[PDB]
Amino acid sequence: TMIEP
Amino acid sequence: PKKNSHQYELLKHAEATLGSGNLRQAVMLPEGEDLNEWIAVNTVDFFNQINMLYGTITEFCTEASCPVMSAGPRYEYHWADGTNIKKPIKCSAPKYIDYLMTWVQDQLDDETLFPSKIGVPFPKNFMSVAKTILKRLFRVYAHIYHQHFDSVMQLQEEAHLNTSFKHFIFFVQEFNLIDRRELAPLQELIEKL
Ligand SMILES: [Zn+2]
Numbered sequence A: 001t002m003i004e005p
Numbered sequence B: 001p002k003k004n005s006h007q008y009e010l011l012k013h014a015e016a017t018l019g020s021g022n023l024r025q026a027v028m029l030p031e032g033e034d035l036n037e038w039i040a041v042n043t044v045d046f047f048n049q050i051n052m053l054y055g056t057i058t059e060f061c062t063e064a065s066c067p068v069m070s071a072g073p074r075y076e077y078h079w080a081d082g083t084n085i086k087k088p089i090k091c092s093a094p095k096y097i098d099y100l101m102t103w104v105q106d107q108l109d110d111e112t113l114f115p116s117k118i119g120v121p122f123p124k125n126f127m128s129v130a131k132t133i134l135k136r137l138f139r140v141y142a143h144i145y146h147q148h149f150d151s152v153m154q155l156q157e158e159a160h161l162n163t164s165f166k167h168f169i170f171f172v173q174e175f176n177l178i179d180r181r182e183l184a185p186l187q188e189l190i191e192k193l
Helices: B006-020 B035-056 B093-108 B126-146 B149-154 B158-175 B180-192
Strands: B069-071 B075-077
Touching: B006 B035, B035 B093, B035 B126, B035 B158, B069 B093, B069 B126, B093 B126, B126 B149, B126 B158, B126 B180, B149 B158, B158 B180
Parallel strands: none
Antiparallel strands: B069 B075
């Protein structure tokens, strides 16, 4: 759903 | 515009009382109001504001400018519900925002979740349903801020976006509707308000 770098 | 019911006074009540400049007090549940109904009324207005705010910069947000949903390079968003899409799908920021906005709309048009009859209680899971809606709306502010802010300021739209975001963050904070985890893309901005 929400990915970081 | 629309001319001339309890939710609708509630809405004009919420919009007008913001003019005191003190947003922390204006966002609080008025005496004796149904908490869900207060949240529902403001959630719709936030959907509408953010829908028109994004609509002003729509021409600068394109498959070419924004190949993924980004709030800065540190944060990226993939679309899932899941109902029609259960596994998060990499897509462009315009496509993703389309899916999110159509999905929010679809929940607003669902009378089980947002009853238009004034005596029908909101569902027991309403609180969870509204938290999911607002959590995703925030990511529309996040992408506009990090990417299209030059366009926001080229149009005269900076104060509009800033006042709506301040209102949004103070409301979300008052009712515990979004986790710190999710507001991290706008962290520096949220601390300054
Ligand atoms: Zn964009």
